[PDB]
Design a protein around this ligand. Structure first.
Ligand SMILES: NCCC[C@H](N)C(=O)O
Ligand SMILES: NCCC[C@H](N)C(=O)O
Lengths: 360, 360
């Protein structure tokens, strides 16, 4: 029973850590543009289809190897996806594209109990991302784990709102209020990272890459054992929930101050502790091609009292320290450029613990 | 609850009927050759990648339209997959290929209860076959049905036994005895048609296209409600179980005389009636590019006492008649060339009845 994880904090025993090797800038299509800050449009317009700066990828490779060494020191078993050239151009009857990377296991795999679920994805450059993880998954399957792949979309034009006000407009907030984004409700789609686990309750967010059909598929597939709840936040470009509402312990959650939750009272009434982390201190001159500066709260909990946190983000380190949580500081400044922090770069396969309810 | 079918005989209410339109001869790769009679090798060697003879496809289209008219007359609701050009060449990071058709819903979709399952397939030319059925499936999903897609294989060389004694050898029987075929155990794969339902018990056959990993995935995915049993027969080229062991009623099964079951005693001890149909009378000059002459026993039961059977196969018609089963004769002689009879050309979506056990 190699696979067994019901939440984000029980004592970690096995984890899959991503790879930065051969990452490629995704073609600048509608869904990618919806996620990109105006500042990087030229980079994407010129680099689409080529490898991310190799000098930079080399630094990220180094940081993640060290992170892996630390995990092993901390008693965690580490597995890595297979190396793959993401520049290969593929063609389905609906579209053609080059790949992205297998840097973020959290984006595609989610473990609910003894079951590993491969998300369908919503980006065309991530259609074949599951190929890097099949060697690991088949091993767990041979060893008794359940394996599920949610329905893979066609990703035909109908899935994308071709006339989304990407170009800048902020009334994206308005559509966002209407539960309307760059992805339509044409067919199910989602990134596993829009779901965050708390035992019998999983919280999901309708985002640029996760539609209501995708959430309904998960809800229906996991009921009656698990309840999937939908929550929303003040965010004009949501993609993944772990740099917005990161659950760090039974009844403790880190809530991004810039992205308040519309349903925060559900949690206050449950007697949950909502901690708002201090601001990130990452330099504005450092490239973050795929995300915001909020990767600082994208921590990974080794256990309730041990958190893997960025070495450079001292303010948040002190925050955990005043709470009695031992900080294990690792530097992943360059890996951050690919789009994620510790929680994004990993997928907890096995955590010592049982299925419980924390919402009462 | 549009979807609800636990077996092959309860009163039929809704069915998906395949399309012959734009069917293409599949590229002559190892797995295709393993299924092709020496007699048609030249046809495949010359026609690979092109449409099957259009004059012939036109006759099949006619026969299936009539079959659909009859089903509507018999009170059955008919749904059809979307028309698609199967000649489009696609490319995954593992291989490149042209498609086949969406003529056989039974090959790719199987209904277990309120859940529709899309098989992964094992042939490269059938990788994207699910695209023709997504419009129908999403409708059922919106209407409350469960939807599952088994893990889609990579279909890389490792899945095929490159040195299979296809060329003719018959010791295929020997490997067949060893549970060894053209598909390895590299990753899960299967055609839904290798499974045949009897309520709480589903029987599966390890075949050229269905491996043990594929069967184990199904067994594990459906337990504990359903028990998936593996059975074998004397067959040097198994692909699909419905022209070998077609279950026609609670405890009644048609067993192909040329393909005896190694576990027939399991059924005799259960008090099941094993009927061996008389030989097919289809002319040897008629082309059957994808199967044997045994399509005659590939009947579809409208209910326990009503069977849709081929108009030309009088011997088997008399057989059902002596058993008190009303024969609804339809001619599908040209549709047979594509590879299947009534059971292959349909997928029972809803049958009036409940989940029961028939093995005691
Ligand atoms: N993998 C998590 C990324 C979180 C979010 N897209 C952000 O920019 O904060
Ligand atoms: N779709 C059922 C085909 C059955 C088998 N391959 C045969 O040739 O009899």
């Amino acid at each position: 029973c190699p696979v067994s994880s019901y939440n984000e904090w029980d004592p970690l025993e096995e984890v899959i850590v991503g790879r930065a090797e051969n990452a490629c800038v995704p073609p600048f299509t509608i869904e990618v543009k919806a996620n990109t800050y105006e500042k990087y449009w030229p980079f994407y317009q010129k680099q689409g289809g080529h490898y991310f700066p190799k000098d930079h990828l080399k630094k990220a490779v180094a940081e993640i190897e060290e992170m892996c060494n630390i995990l092993k020191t901390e008693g965690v078993t580490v597995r890595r996806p297979d190396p793959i050239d993401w520049s290969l151009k593929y063609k389905t009857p609906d579209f053609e594209s080059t790949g992205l990377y297998s840097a973020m296991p959290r984006d595609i795999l989610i473990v609910v109990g003894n079951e590993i679920i491969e998300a369908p994805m919503a980006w065309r450059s991530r259609f074949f991302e599951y190929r890097a993880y099949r060697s690991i998954i088949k091993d767990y399957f041979h060893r008794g784990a359940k394996w599920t792949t949610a329905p893979k979309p066609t990703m035909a034009d109908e899935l994308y709102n071709q006339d989304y006000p990407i170009h800048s407009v902020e009334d994206r907030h308005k559509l966002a209020a209407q539960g309307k984004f760059v992805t339509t409700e044409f067919e199910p789609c989602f990134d596993a990272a829009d779901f965050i686990r708390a035992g019998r309750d999983i919280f999901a967010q309708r985002s640029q890459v996760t539609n209501y059909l995708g959430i309904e598929w998960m809800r229906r597939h996991l009921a009656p054992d698990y309840r999937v709840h939908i929550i929303s936040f003040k965010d004009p470009n949501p993609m993944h929930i772990d740099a917005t509402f990161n659950i760090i312990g039974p009844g403790i959650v880190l809530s991004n101050p810039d992205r308040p939750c519309h349903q925060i009272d559900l949690f206050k009434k449950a007697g949950w502790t909502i901690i708002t982390p201090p601001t990130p201190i990452i330099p504005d001159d450092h490239p973050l091609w795929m995300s915001s500066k909020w990767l600082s709260m994208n921590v990974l909990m080794l256990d309730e009292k041990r958190v893997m946190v960025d070495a450079n983000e001292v303010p948040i380190q002190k925050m955990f320290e005043k709470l009695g949580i031992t900080t294990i500081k690792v530097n992943i400044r360059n890996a951050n450029s690919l789009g994620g922090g510790f929680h994004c770069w990993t997928c907890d396969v096995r955590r010592r613990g049982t299925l419980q309810s924390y919402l009462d």
